[PDB]
Paper text:
Fluorescent proteins share a common structure composed of an eleven-stranded β-barrel containing a chromophore that is spontaneously formed through cyclization of a tri-peptide sequence following the central α-helix.
The [name] mutants were named [name]-nG, where n is the number of the inserted amino acids (1, G; 3, GGG; 6, GGSGGT; 9, GGSGGTGGS; and 12, GGSGGTGGSGGT). The glycine insertion shifts β-strand 7 along the chain to the N-terminal direction for [name]-3G and the C-terminal direction for [name]-1G. The space is filled by water molecules in both [name]-1G and [name]-3G structures (arrow heads). While [name] did not show the pressure dependency in fluorescent intensity below 50 MPa (red), the single glycine insertion made [name] sensitive to the pressure (blue), and the further glycine insertion enhanced its pressure dependency (green).
Author numbering: 1 to 64, 68 to 231
The structure:
Amino acid sequence: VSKGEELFTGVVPILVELDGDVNGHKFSVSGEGEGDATYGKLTLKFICTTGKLPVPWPTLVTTFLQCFARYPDHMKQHDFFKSAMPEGYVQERTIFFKDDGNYKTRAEVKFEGDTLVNRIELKGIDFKEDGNILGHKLEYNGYNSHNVYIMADKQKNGIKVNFKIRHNIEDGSVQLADHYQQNTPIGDGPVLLPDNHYLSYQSALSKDPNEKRDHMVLLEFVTAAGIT
């Protein structure tokens, strides 16, 4: 196994800490769980520690650990995420909500000992007061996409990722969220610059029946594909 790959052969504990500000509405979220890349499995629970989350949990699903994706053996050489570990990488995204505002996120993903940690800062601007986001008009469910596109970015020694999410609006319509992403390694060591490929997602949202705080239980299965 590769140096980076070896860090993911078993169950890895995860910690996520996010500070956000959407149209001046400030909030913080703490998350805990575990990743089992062998099965492309993520099991997580996020808690808003500042009170009520000012945006719908579904809009934060993509922000809330691609290093846990299951890369088929024949595609191992295209797994940028694990190759950058343990020093990690910085993930940046601009998420454009159609006919509404946008989120810009900066996440530092790396190991703190044997724990995979993600420190995230989220900034949202230009949102409409009674739009689907600030007006909480989105159904509490996930989105499953087979089109999370990955390609190399030799200029930052990393990758570029793009994909679309369609959140379900309570009236039966959909709220599009266009994602543009870039990942840059934190260390100066070699990383695997991948050939074009994609990740396939299965995402499910739920609630902890005994939890009184505003929270989200998230289960995902992530698999790389596209290179035969």
